[PDB]
């Protein structure tokens, strides 16, 4: 029977070490961590991430300032408080919500953000830099995924690592995640013949295609590490992930719940990025 | 067997040819010829051999070219008003800085102060990042040349399982976003593999990119592979041969490139195609 990856308990944990941070940042009389986070209309869902990230940030003791801006803003607008934003030195992470209106420029408005405090760790710089094998700010959901393979004291090094999905929110950067981490690294997708091949292959195995059930549990190689990432919700309310959770753990050696698995990471890696621009890059001692 | 050879000397004529189509066309039309900055500090003979083959080999295409050469003691901030200067100037389409620097300088530090938009190499983190997440601009010379010895000669990479010998960030790391651009599925070996073989053996498109002569015998060549060897290595002998035991691989592989003659030659046509996409997209559109 597989080991959990309780990735609510390292999520809190992560949390708790920040929080403990800023904690000792205020003792020495140094600013907290400033999140600053830009919205251009009133979509419900957007609605909802500002609360997230407000919510996260009043949790460990930040400053969060929150942009909430018309629909007629111009694009130009934006970028201006982008520049001023970049300029501000007590912010140290910007997010701007997506979706913009239509006839924003999103990639001109997010590539505007200065890399040191793009604290979601996708402007193309900080992907390449990672890319790179000298990684600044992250995407968030793939470092937190390596927080929990460190977290469980997994050695990563020479492990055969296959990813199922290859988006640019999750595969890509986590194949560079695990190449950095010592894995040979193996990025599937929707043209990978014979996937089944691979999973049975693979020590580590991170899927992250958001269909449930698309890996069946019988192909995981017994011993595996198995990183859930889908989080799909199932018409009688109950939420699964793209790997079939209970034939899978009886091969594994870990495995990822769905729901409290990778999901808490993604947050809590948020919140980690922003304290280290201010630690690191904006308000170094 | 008898692989068909994959004749990189032959398509970078091609290709220098096409550009310099352009070029003239450019110059017909009353246009600026793309222009190449080149940065020297310093006096090794390290330097001055890469250099002239460019002063010239973008000069064969009708590029202008201007070096730079500056005193070893350059200060690392003159260095850097430099590079502000070639990047505002309209008439620069590509910057190349060489490398080593002097000590003392930060390497880093001078190289991501190009702008992208005239990183011909393709090494700045920006242009990696927009390369690994879909969206490339300016790309990494061996593997954009690799991509297009694969274009030309209509091999279909869409589902390949491709491996990459090596992770390096000048080859084995953009190699395997290219590829994954292009389709495949995308293994990337290195010094932590456990049994290089296996994945070798399964390989329908091979890269190798480890700079040691024969270090992958042809036993390892999967029946069909299509092979791509970076290596050049000199030999206490004169001239080059290649990461792949030529012989042995081409009775099994169905492509395969030689050595000299196979990548050497694309890496260097992609950097002027990259100049002048840099020139017509970029700069002068």
Redesign the interface.
């Known amino acids: 029977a597989a080991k959990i990856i309780d990735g609510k308990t390292i999520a809190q944990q992560v949390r708790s070490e920040v929080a403990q941070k800023v904690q000792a940042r205020i003792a020495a009389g140094l600013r907290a961590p400033g999140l600053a986070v830009v919205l251009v209309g009133s979509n419900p869902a957007s609605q909802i991430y500002v609360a997230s990230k407000r919510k996260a940030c009043e949790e460990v003791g930040f400053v969060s300032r929150s942009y909430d801006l018309p629909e007629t803003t111009s694009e130009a607008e934006l970028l201006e408080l982008i520049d001023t934003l970049n300029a501000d030195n007590t912010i140290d992470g910007i997010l701007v919500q997506l979706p913009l209106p239509a006839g924003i420029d999103n ?1 001109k408005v997010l590539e505007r953000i200065h890399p040191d405090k793009d604290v979601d760790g ?8 990672l ?4 990684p600044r700010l992250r995407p968030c959901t793939p470092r937190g995924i390596v927080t929990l393979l460190e977290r469980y004291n997994i050695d990563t ?2 492990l ?1 690592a296959v990813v199922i999905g ?1 988006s ?1 929110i999750v595969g ?2 986590m ?2 995640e695990l ?1 950095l981490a ?8 929707r ?3 014979n996937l089944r091949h ?1 999973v049975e292959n693979a020590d580590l195995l991170i899927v992250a295609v958001g269909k449930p059930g698309f890996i069946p549990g019988d192909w995981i190689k017994e011993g595996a590490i198995v990183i859930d990432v889908g989080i799909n919700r199932l018409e009688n309310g109950k939420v699964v992930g793209d790997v079939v959770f209970e034939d899978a753990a009886k091969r594994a050696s870990y495995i990822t719940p769905v729901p409290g698995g990778v999901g808490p990471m993604t947050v809590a890696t948020l919140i980690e990025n922003t304290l280290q621009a201010c630690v690191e890059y904006h308000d170094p001692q």
């Open positions: 990639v996708f402007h193309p710089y900080n992907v390449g830099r890319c790179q094998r000298a090094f020479g055969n290859a640019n890509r950067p194949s560079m190449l010592g894995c040979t690294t193996t990025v599937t997708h043209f990978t013949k691979h």
